[PDB]
Design a binder for this molecule. Structure first.
Ligand SMILES: [Cl-]
Ligand SMILES: [Cl-]
Length: 190
């Protein structure tokens, strides 16, 4: 078995603890959106879609929530409806949580098909072997495929803590809306 794929995949999970990613997201429903994804393992992440895509997703150890500016709505995201679940996975937990369905290797790219043992959600991961980075992530939700393209990955040395907070808008008001430049102003690169 091409077990090296898990090794490479595991390596990424161990070394990408604190990153910011410029990404493009495409779906079967026609949406195309760009955004900034901040990951601060063990549990914290912020998916900051750029305008006009009115959604911010903030995940912490206690909660994973979504805010829709257009709907003025706060929601909670089930692990089965979290497309960023693999990126938070600890390597030690990989074998407990995922099973590799298949591996395909072409030139510098390696495509790994995996499935979550609990949520049974299938996903496809593209690995760039030259720089050992994830380039494409595909999530299969019944009749919809969500594709996340990793346009740029940078390591972060310190995050503004409030980037991983989503305060009750009913009490503390609407969360700050951040553009690409605005969000880059609130964390320090390595
Ligand atoms: Cl998953
Ligand atoms: Cl979405």
């Amino acid at each position: 078995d091409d077990k090296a794929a898990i090794l490479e995949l595991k390596t990424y999970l161990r070394t990408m603890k604190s990153i910011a990613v410029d990404f493009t997201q495409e779906d079967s429903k026609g949406n195309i959106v760009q955004g900034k994804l901040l990951i601060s393992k063990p549990y914290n992440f912020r998916c900051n879609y750029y305008p006009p895509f009115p959604i911010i997703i903030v995940g912490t150890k206690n909660f994973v929530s979504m805010y829709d500016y257009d709907m003025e709505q706060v929601s909670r995201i089930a692990r089965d409806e979290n497309i960023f679940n693999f990126l938070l996975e600890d390597n030690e937990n990989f074998d407990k949580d995922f099973v590799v369905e298949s591996v395909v290797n072409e030139k510098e790219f390696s495509r790994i098909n995996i499935y979550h043992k609990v949520t049974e959600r299938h996903s496809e991961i593209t690995l760039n072997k030259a720089n050992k980075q994830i380039e494409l992530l595909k999530i299969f939700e019944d009749t919809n495929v969500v594709t996340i393209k990793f346009d740029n990955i940078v390591k972060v040395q310190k995050f503004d803590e409030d980037l991983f907070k989503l305060k009750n808008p009913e009490i503390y008001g609407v969360p700050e809306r951040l553009t690409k430049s605005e969000i880059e102003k609130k964390y320090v690169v390595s």
